[PDB]
Design a protein around this ligand. Sequence first.
Ligand SMILES: Cc1cc2nc3c(=O)[nH]c(=O)nc-3n(C[C@H](O)[C@H](O)[C@H](O)COP(=O)(O)O)c2cc1C
Ligand SMILES: Cc1cc2nc3c(=O)[nH]c(=O)nc-3n(C[C@H](O)[C@H](O)[C@H](O)COP(=O)(O)O)c2cc1C
Lengths: 350, 350
Amino acid sequence: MKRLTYISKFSRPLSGDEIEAIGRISSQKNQQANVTGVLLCLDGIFFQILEGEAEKIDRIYERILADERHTDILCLKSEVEVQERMFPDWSMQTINLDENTDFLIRPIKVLLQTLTESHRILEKYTQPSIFKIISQGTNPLNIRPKAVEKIVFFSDIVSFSTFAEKLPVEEVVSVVNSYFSVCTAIITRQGGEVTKFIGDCVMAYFDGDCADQAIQASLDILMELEILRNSAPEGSPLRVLYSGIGLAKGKVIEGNIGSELKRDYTILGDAVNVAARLEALTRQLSQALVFSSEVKNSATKSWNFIWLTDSELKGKSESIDIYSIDNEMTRKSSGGLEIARNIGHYLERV
Amino acid sequence: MKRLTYISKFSRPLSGDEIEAIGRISSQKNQQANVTGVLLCLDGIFFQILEGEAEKIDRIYERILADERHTDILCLKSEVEVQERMFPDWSMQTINLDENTDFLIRPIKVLLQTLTESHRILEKYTQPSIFKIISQGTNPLNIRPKAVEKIVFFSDIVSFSTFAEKLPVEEVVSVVNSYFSVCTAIITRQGGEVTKFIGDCVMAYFDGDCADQAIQASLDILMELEILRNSAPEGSPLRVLYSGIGLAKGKVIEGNIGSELKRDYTILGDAVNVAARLEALTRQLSQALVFSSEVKNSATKSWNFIWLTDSELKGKSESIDIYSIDNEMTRKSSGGLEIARNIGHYLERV
Ligand SMILES: Cc1cc2nc3c(=O)[nH]c(=O)nc-3n(C[C@H](O)[C@H](O)[C@H](O)COP(=O)(O)O)c2cc1C
Ligand SMILES: Cc1cc2nc3c(=O)[nH]c(=O)nc-3n(C[C@H](O)[C@H](O)[C@H](O)COP(=O)(O)O)c2cc1C
C-alpha cells in the first residue's frame, strides 16, 4: 500500500460549505476505491493524508494536483511500502478546524499554523531536488553517496560586474533573479536539476545519457533570453541581459555534502570544474554556448556542431576539444557577448 | 510584549511524570513573571509558546536553551511587538498528546508528527543565516536587498582532485564533510556566516569592520586542521587534508537571490570574486592564507603581516597588493601546500 501526506493553500477563499462538499465527494470516490484518510483545513491551508493501492493513490493525487481550488501543493511524506492503514473507518473524514472551538484543539491550532508557515518559509530556501526525493518516498538524509555519470551545466550573466556597478541594489537583484528564474524553469522542464547558484552563476546537471536534453535546454535558455531582451521596456536593464553557457560530461559523486548542520544534496567532481572553465571561455571564443567533445559525441540528435578550438586548463595535463552549435540563435547570442562588452553607458542612464 | 515559539527534541526518554513536573514548575515561575503560554509534547518532541516582556522572555529562553533535557532547539517564530497575549489564563498549560486519545486529536497527532519530521529534514538543508534571522523576529523572505561592507572568506581543499580520484566515494564525502564542519564551526563562533559550499570550497562572510575576526577565524581553521591531521588514524586520508584561504573586503549586495521557487539569503559582489581569486593563488604564492591590502589595513590588531606580491586579475584593470601573516602555523600550513602536491600514492593505499 501507499500512504501519502500533503499540504496546500486555498487558491481563493472557500467556505465551510465548499469545504464539506469537497469532503463529501472525496469520501464518495474514496469509498469506491478502498482508499481511506483524513482532510483538514485551517486558515486557508489544506492538510490531507491518503492511503490505498499505489495504483489508485497515484491517480487520485494526479487529479488533486490538477485541481485549481488549491495551489502550492507539497507532499510532506510518501510511504510506498505500507501494509496497514491509519484511518480504516474513514473514506474521507473532514475536520474543519476553523469552525472548531474545543478546549485542547485551540492551542494545537495556533501550533499547526505556526509550524506550517515556518515550513513554507523553509521551502523557499530548499533545493528542488529534496522535495522530488521526498515525493519519491525517500528521506533525502538517508541517501548514500554514489558515483554517477552527469552532464554538468554552468551559466552566468555576461558583464554582470557592470550591472552591479551601475544599478540600484534592488535593480541588480531583480535582474539576477529574472535570469535565474528563466534558467531554472527551462532546465527543470528538460529533466535537469538546478543544484546551486553562486554569484550570478547557475550550476545544474542532467543524467549522463541526456546530452540532447542538456543541449536543448541551453538553446531554449538562449531563446528565452532573446524573448526577454526584445520584449523588455525601454531603458530596462533586461534589454542587455546576455548569458554564456558551458556543458561538460563526467563521472561525479552525488550525495549529501556539507557541515553537520547544513548540507546540500548535490554533485562533486571534475566535470563541474570543466563545465565552469568551459563557460568562462565563452568570451574568448565569442560563442555563447560551448561544450566538450564528450558532450558532443554523447548526444544522439543531429545538431549542427561546429568545432571551435583545442584548449587546456588544470590538471590532467590534457587539451580538450571544444564545440558549439551553429544556428541563428547561437550566432545572435554570440554577437551578444560583443554587445555586452560596453553596456555601462546604457545601464547608468536607467 | 514578545511571544516566542520553539520546538525541541527530548535528549533522552522522559515520562509523563517528568513532563508534568517540568510543566508544574514552569507554570510556577511563569506565574511569578506574568509570562503565559502552552507546552505540548508528542513522541519525544516539545513544542512551546511563551509570551511576556522581552526582558523576561529572553531570560527564560536563555535557561530553556541551557537545559540538557531537550536538544535541537529551534525557534519557529519570534514576535517582538506583541500587544495582546494568546494564552492569558495559562501560566503554563501542559498538554501531553501521547496520553491523549480523543476522537479529533488523533488525526491531528499524526499530522503534527509528519509536519514536524518534515520541518526537521528541511532544517538540515537550510542556511544557518535563515534561522538566526527568524530568531531575531524577522521573516527572512521580507528582507529587502542592501549594499553592505563585508569581509569575504573563501577556502578549499588542496589537491582535492587527488582525493576524488583515489578514494571510494563514501571516503571522499566523509573527508569533505569533515573539512566543511571544521570551517563552519570556527567561522560561526567568530561571528561570521557560512553562506555557500561549492565543490570542496567554502564561501563565507564577516561584517566589514571585523577583519580581525576574519583573520583569527582563518588562523583557527589552520590550527584545527593541524590538530585533525596529526590526530588522524594511520593511513587516514585526513592526514593529508590541507586548506588554502583567501580574504577580501568590499561593498557587496546582501539579500534573497535566486529563482522563483528557490532562493538563498546571501551576498553578491566583486569582493566575492576577489576572495575566490586570491584563494586560487595560494598555490603559486606558497602561502596557505592570503588576503588583500584592504583586509590588512582594515584590521586593528597587531598581526605579523608579510607582503607577498603585487598581482592582477579581472576587470578593474588594477594590480592588488597581497599579504599573509608570518607565524609558525602559517609556515607549517604553507609547507602543507607542497606536501599536498603528491599525495596520490598515500591516498591510493588506504
Ligand atoms: C483539499 C482537496 C482534497 C481532495 N481530496 C480528494 C480525494 O481524496 N479523492 C478524490 O478523488 N478527489 C479529491 N479532491 C478533488 C480532485 O482533485 C478532483 O476534483 C476529483 O477527484 C475528480 O473528480 P472527477 O471524477 O469528476 O474527475 C480533493 C480536492 C481538494 C481541493
Ligand atoms: C520543555 C521545557 C519547557 C520549559 N519551559 C520553561 C518555562 O516556560 N519557564 C521556565 O522558567 N523554565 C522552563 N523550563 C526549564 C528551564 O530550562 C529551567 O529548568 C528553569 O527555568 C530554571 O530554573 P532555576 O530557577 O532553578 O534556574 C522548561 C524546560 C523544558 C525541558
